[PDB]
Ligand binder design. Structure first.
Ligand SMILES: Cc1ncc(COP(=O)(O)O)c(C=O)c1O
Ligand SMILES: Cc1ncc(COP(=O)(O)O)c(C=O)c1O
Lengths: 405, 405
């Protein structure tokens, strides 16, 4: 007879779920969904490519057996995939200097890497303020010291590049740091090239260890190689680092949990070791990755007509989004007038990625629910869920709501 | 510049991989594969059903969107699945007393449960001797005390039911115990019904907490509800427990990593809590399960023509295997004569599951490699990989090899 459940309390979850509850917990239709990590279609329902639907078909055509992955990934997976981050061709790729592995989405790659860091002398991790929430949970709940680096400027609404590089300069030495360089979650502010070179110099002097978080290649810009420039610049005049890569939004592969982990190694013989360490680590958890989601990925990425058909719809996507964001603040500059409010909404258009980040709205978050619109506690906003129909209602209620103070 | 890799040593892996290396590391064709966890076809290559190939097709027909699983499983998944272990109908199922969740294979379910046990006052875990290897690794490498209960009798070659229930009687109280009741890995010896009732009585007096490991429903017997009887008996006169369930061999879904976790709860309101705890736990790892492998499973299991077509091929499978095992020792009783050896091979036919377990062979394991046949260090033997062609060569070399002492 299980009694263990006697000491069993219930838990407060992340901001991201108290709200997920709330969206689908009331009677009203015309409910609005602006908190979800997902990207919405024109019809306000989940997105999916055709390239991906075709990769799917392609996969159940070419494959009949379903083997365990030896493996922690394929050979095509680990080359096709790393093309996307390091481009082509690379000093690193064809010299077999990258050890890459298939994980369970970006989350899945982050966590194995953290498990891999406990493996070493890694007591402390730096994260840029404010940080992707789960990073906090994932880091902390395995007893690392979590420290914060200055980043987003809360009053200017841009990165504070002065204080960011400052901390980057007086934080020990060979400190381990997590960077979101593009499509920042939640900030939605990417690092301008103006500053790459200085960083490279700081990172070289301090010999820091960098972990790049790449969840949205192709949302910050029109060209998707742009979004990953710092990495490529880093590679030239070779520095070592790590990459957690998600395709949850890239390929619209949400539930498939498609992700990768890239670790840059000194020689063809360190690659071999780290690999065994990783396989080892993976075996006290789930032993191996999903073969289906491996196949779907190789098929798409490995075929030109699909890669090119996808990249296009992808390029066509970031456009619509950054456009939708422009439109949005323009409706707020307007409705604003009805309530005689005096806010500069122009400063949130600079922003890029799946969201916009309006700290000001943190104040109005629980009042925006009396009307049937849901938004994260901190100001973050799923832009992809604002239809041509939606703008008025939303923008109005934001102002209406704002004026009650 | 990554320096961390300075303290980086390479690791000795489990017996199961030093060998996996070895199988595919030599020039000889007519190499024989008797170590692999997988089940081999007539042609000595990996198995797969037609029901499963059809579920696959079915799935890419009915589904176009790919959402995150809220969720940690579906509603169909958690009812369809638990039918298989608790039968139908159950006192537990329709009274919403089971909390079940979709995991990444059996491994994936074992580990979340262990993470769930650290969550409580669980300092010590009992395992039956000898234990599924990974259990050792998974338990220990998170700082539980691992203790062993008497089980398999090494000289008689059957369970020692006398000493097994003994320990079961003097091991603290509400001790947490892992049981493989059928298709034991490695032993290949299942618990006879003769003894179920006594156990139920012991487990009731000592209030122990049981975790059943079910990786092979349908390999121990002809009827696949048989293999899970103890569980169903346990359910009548309701006791609480847990189930880790893999479909890696059941559905031949190896790389798909299909698995489930069942926890039996006091009321419809403990279910709700444990659920939140589990979601919580899952979120410091991979956040959610694979949607594809969820869909493949529901489709098969939910459609009669496929469930029935699968169960049949399944029932047709355990037959062939236990037959293949009978044949095998009969060739060893024969070739044995050529070398004038005097071993009783009849005692290994009782055995059941994907393997046979012959401790005697542990002695001959590294000599059986000079001939091109591979076998685990402890005696375990993948029976499914012995073709009508193979018997002679294998059985001969075993005897030949045995006689060199
Ligand atoms: C910054 C960041 N890192 C990692 C992830 C993890 O993505 P996934 O759900 O595919 O693991 C996300 C969410 O997409 C994210 O926004
Ligand atoms: C006893 C036992 N438990 C758990 C597992 C884990 O199976 P999976 O690879 O699907 O996670 C296995 C292997 O099939 C096993 O033999």
């Amino acid at each position: 007879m299980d009694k263990l459940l006697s000491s069993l309390e219930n838990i407060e979850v992340d901001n991201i779920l108290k709200t997920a509850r709330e969206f689908k917990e009331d009677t009203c239709e015309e409910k609005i969904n602006l908190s979800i990590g997902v990207c919405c279609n024109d019809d306000g329902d989940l997105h999916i490519f055709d390239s991906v639907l075709n990769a799917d078909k392609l996969v159940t055509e070419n494959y009949k057996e379903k083997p365990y992955l030896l493996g922690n990934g394929t050979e095509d997976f680990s080359t096709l995939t790393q093309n996307l981050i390091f481009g082509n061709n690379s000093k690193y790729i064809e010299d077999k200097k990258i050890c890459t592995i298939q994980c369970i989405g970006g989350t899945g790659a982050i966590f194995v890497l953290l498990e891999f860091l406990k493996m070493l002398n890694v007591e402390t991790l730096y994260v840029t303020n404010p940080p992707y929430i789960n990073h906090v949970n994932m880091i902390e709940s395995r007893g690392f010291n979590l420290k914060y680096i200055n980043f987003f400027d809360y009053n200017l609404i841009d990165i504070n590049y002065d204080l960011f590089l400052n901390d980057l300069r007086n934080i020990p030495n060979g400190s381990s740091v997590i960077l979101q360089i593009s499509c920042y979650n939640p900030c939605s502010v990417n690092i301008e090239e103006k500053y790459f070179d200085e960083i490279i110099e700081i990172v070289l002097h301090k010999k820091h260890v960098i972990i790049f978080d790449i969840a949205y290649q192709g949302f910050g810009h029109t060209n998707l190689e742009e979004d990953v420039l710092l990495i490529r610049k880093f590679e030239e005049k070779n520095i070592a680092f790590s990459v957690c890569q998600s395709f949850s939004k890239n390929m619209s592969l949400y539930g498939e949990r498609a992700g990768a982990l890239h670790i840059v190694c000194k020689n063809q013989e360190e690659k071999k070791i780290v690999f065994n360490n990783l396989c080892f680590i993976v075996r006290k958890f789930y032993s191996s990755p999903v073969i289906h989601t491996n196949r779907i990925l190789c098929q798409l990425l490995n075929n030109q007509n699909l890669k090119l058909n996808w990249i296009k719809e992808l390029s066509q996507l970031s456009q619509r989004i950054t456009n939708n964001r422009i439109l949005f603040f323009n409706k707020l500059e307007t409705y604003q007038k009805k309530y005689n409010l005096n806010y500069d909404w122009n400063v949130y258009k600079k922003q890029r990625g799946l969201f916009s980040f309006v700290p000001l709205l943190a104040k109005i978050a629980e009042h925006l629910k009396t009307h049937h619109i849901y938004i994260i506690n901190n100001g973050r906003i799923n832009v992809s869920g604002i239809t041509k129909n939606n703008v008025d209602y939303i923008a109005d209620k934001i102002c209406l709501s704002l004026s009650q103070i």
